[PDB]
Design a protein around this nucleic acid. Structure first.
Lengths: 36, 102, 17, 39, 247, 125, 104, 85
RNA sequence: UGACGGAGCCAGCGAGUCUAACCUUGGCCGAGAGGUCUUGGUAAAAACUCCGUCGGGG
């Protein structure tokens, strides 16, 4: 109600393919960094 | 806007505008000695060491416009004329210099 | 020695049904 | 000039070929005879 | 104890039986107390591993399918020296349909081992690739982001490509494994190769996978099992079921 | 009203519609300038009217064409036909008959196929 | 008038004679099994010009490249670069069935 | 050895020569061929050439070194109402 | 009388609620018949045009 009263007194997602949120991969910092 | 460089089995055309290789002729079986541009540019001659000259028109490494077989000794010097444009001069280690009409 | 008798029990329950 | 000599006059594969040709012949023949029977 | 004992038994049965030698993958099938409400699409849904890597891009050939133009995509990917040695082949969908049909198509199927395409082309992909690919999950086409950039309503998108991001995707994928939702209690996932690693690695992989699947968090991706899980069977492509965690 | 004239062109099974309007002086074969009809061994077989009559006669007006049917060679012949016929039709509707008749004479001097496509009927024996 | 330059004929490698009159990538693909892309990868790992013919690739470079090619596991090269009686029985059955159908 | 002329230069004609010692020199054919300029590259410089007289573009100087080195040294070269207003 | 990668571009016929495969591992359900899920392997516009590259077969 504090936020609401102040207002009154004042990740990735595509819109067209929902299949993307399952389709994406887990970006992993070591997985970019290493030159294996 | 262009100049030609000879080397061991590599004739490279460089452009006067960006100083990188613009074209390559490499169909040469042995050490290509010398390159000469015609006094009107469309055509270059290149004397190899096997004993022949390749004469073909600039910018088109796909066409072996003509291959002339002079004496079998290697040819060190090849050039176009400058007053005629269909006369091409070559010489070879045979110590005899031969003028061909293309 | 496990594969053969686990198969056996499989067919056992099938035949039992 | 170099010279040469001319030519003139696998049992497993040979018998395979002969028997397969025999089989094909027989299959064609039995087709045709059964067909005549049917007509 | 049952787990690794059955693992040893199934191994020895593989090396004894002719065809069981010929099929080369370990598969685990989870039967759940409840069905899944997620109707089967072919979106490849992947699961992470916390401990052990499985396959390497260095070890595997790979196919990439772009958008249509593909000029800058392919040249950039082949030039930036981070993928030139990495992606075996790159092809656009139209060129693919122009080049392969029928016999040559299944020739591809035999040749490649892992394929992926842009997430704006994945849904179109099936008919140009064929039901022949679309069986099981071995050569099921994957789905990778290509731009690390998003679209907004009534706003044209701009297309890019970055080898760091895409290589991260590939390495992540071959490090971990995946699955596909169904509508019944029976879901199957490949787990490990028959000689690339060991039984302790197998068990670690299994435990991490089951923890991810049962995890309350990551519901869009990991919290998918409904009800008390029943059990986990193990097999190879032609073997028989072996039981684990009966209750 | 806008001065306006339309004509047609037909090779093997290729249609070529050609509007001709009085305007800004350009030439567009279906949304892309005539310099980029693609065959490139025939682009001059397209130009043939432009050149043969000289340009200003075109500088006065706007020609839009669209083509369909047939293939490469047929479509090029169809466009050249439609351009030429459209030019003469416009110059006989809104401009002087002397231009009409001398244009027709120039064309039929060069090659009549720019005007009457041959319906190349099959033949008995 | 003394100048002085920096060859040899076809040199064998992996029980295979590598031609003396071809480019680097050409010779690498001509080596039994290897192809154009793998040739490019090997040439790039060795860091030698690809359009230089067999006149180039001096002994040190040749030895290093040979070691690299012999040890892909130590070179981390991409893995995409590596690599009757029933007829008789049917005939006899045909003989039997045909004899029955054409005789009886 | 190569001769160029009739190009934009305080010198009317120029002759350039390559002498196996990095040293390429520029002479003129009007001062009785006196030395005018020189460069030194390391190896024995076997070939030398200049951009010709009608270059009209960034002029170039090509030297070929028997050490297998090509070297080049170059010289480089509102609204319509408002306007009717 | 070519090969290969990207490009470039143009057809005409045909429109019946009817147009289209089988083997295989195992899960669940089902009294059954069976059903659902897995599951592994085998059956089915070109030429042309402009750029780039290469230079006898088991």
């Amino acid at each position: 109600l504090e936020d609401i009263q102040q207002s009154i007194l004042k990740f990735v997602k595509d819109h067209r393919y929902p299949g993307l949120t399952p389709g994406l991969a887990p970006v992993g910092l070591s997985d970019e960094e290493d030159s294996s | 806007h262009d100049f030609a460089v000879t080397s061991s089995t590599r004739v490279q055309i460089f452009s006067s505008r960006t100083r990188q290789v613009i074209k390559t002729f490499s169909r040469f079986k042995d050490v290509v000695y010398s390159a000469s541009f015609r006094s009107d540019g469309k055509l270059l001659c290149a004397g190899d060491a096997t004993g022949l000259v390749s004469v073909y028109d600039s910018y088109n490494p796909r066409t072996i416009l003509l291959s002339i077989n002079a004496s079998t000794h290697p040819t060190h010097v090849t050039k176009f004329h400058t007053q005629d444009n269909k006369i091409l001069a070559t010489a070879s280690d045979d110590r005899v210099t031969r003028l061909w009409d293309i | 020695d496990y594969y053969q008798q686990v198969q056996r029990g499989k067919q056992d329950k099938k035949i039992s049904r | 000039i170099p010279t040469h000599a001319p030519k003139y006059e696998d049992r497993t594969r040979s018998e395979i070929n002969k028997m397969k040709a025999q089989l094909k012949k027989e299959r064609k023949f039995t087709m045709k005879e059964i067909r005549k029977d049917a007509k | 104890g049952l787990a690794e004992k059955a693992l040893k038994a199934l191994i020895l049965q593989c090396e004894e039986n002719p065809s069981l030698k010929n099929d080369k993958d370990i598969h685990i099938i989870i039967n759940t107390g409840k069905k899944m409400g997620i109707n089967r699409d072919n979106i490849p849904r992947i699961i992470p591993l916390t401990k052990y890597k499985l396959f390497k891009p260095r070890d595997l050939n790979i196919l990439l399918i772009t958008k249509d133009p593909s000029a800058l995509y392919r040249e950039t990917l082949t030039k930036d020296e981070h993928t030139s040695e990495l992606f075996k082949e790159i092809i656009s969908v139209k060129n693919l349909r122009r080049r392969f049909k029928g016999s040559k198509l299944t020739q591809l199927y035999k040749d490649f081992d892992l394929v992926v395409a842009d997430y704006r082309v994945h849904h179109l992909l099936p008919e140009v690739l064929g039901s022949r690919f679309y069986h099981g999950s071995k050569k099921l086409p994957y789905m990778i982001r290509m731009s690390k950039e998003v679209k907004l309503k009534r706003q044209q998108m701009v297309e890019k490509c970055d080898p760091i991001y895409v290589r991260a995707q590939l390495r992540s994928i071959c490090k971990n494994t995946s699955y596909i939702p169904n509508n019944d209690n029976c879901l199957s996932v490949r787990v490990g190769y028959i000689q690339k690693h060991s039984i302790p690695e197998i068990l670690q992989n299994i435990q991490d996978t089951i923890n991810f699947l049962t995890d309350k968090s990551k519901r869009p991706q990991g919290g998918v099992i409904k009800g008390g899980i029943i059990s986990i069977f193990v097999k190879t492509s032609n073997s028989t079921s072996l039981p684990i965690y009966q209750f | 009203a806008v001065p306006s004239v339309q004509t047609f062109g037909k090779k093997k099974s290729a249609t070529a519609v050609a509007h001709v309007k009085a305007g800004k002086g350009l030439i567009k074969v279906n949304g892309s300038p005539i310099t980029l009809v693609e065959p490139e061994i025939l682009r001059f077989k397209v130009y043939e009217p432009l050149l043969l009559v000289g340009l200003d006669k075109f500088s006065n007006i706007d020609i839009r064409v669209r083509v369909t049917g047939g293939g490469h060679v047929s479509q090029v012949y169809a466009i050249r036909q439609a351009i030429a016929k459209g030019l003469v039709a416009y110059h006989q509707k809104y401009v002087d008959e002397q231009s009409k008749n001398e244009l027709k004479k120039a064309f039929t001097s060069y090659d009549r196929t720019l005007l009457i496509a041959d319906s190349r009927r099959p033949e008995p024996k | 008038s003394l100048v002085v330059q920096e060859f040899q004929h076809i040199l064998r490698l992996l029980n295979t004679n590598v031609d003396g009159n071809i480019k680097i990538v050409y010779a690498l693909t001509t080596i039994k099994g290897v192809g154009r892309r793998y040739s490019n990868l090997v040439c790039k790992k060795a860091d030698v010009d690809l359009h230089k013919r067999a006149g180039e690739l001096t002994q040190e470079e040749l030895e290093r490249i040979v070691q690299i090619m012999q040890n892909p596991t130590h070179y981390k090269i991409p893995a995409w670069f590596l690599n009757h009686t029933l007829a008789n029985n049917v005939e006899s059955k045909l003989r039997d069935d045909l004899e029955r159908l054409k005789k009886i | 050895l190569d001769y160029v002329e009739n190009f934009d230069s305080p010198m009317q004609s120029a002759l350039i020569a390559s002498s196996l010692d990095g040293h390429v020199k520029v002479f003129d054919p009007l001062d009785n061929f006196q030395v005018k300029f020189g460069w030194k590259f390391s190896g024995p410089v076997l070939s030398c050439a200049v951009s010709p007289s009608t270059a009209q573009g960034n002029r170039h100087l090509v030297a070929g070194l028997s050490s297998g080195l090509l070297a080049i040294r170059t010289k480089k070269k509102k609204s319509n109402n408002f306007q009717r207003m």
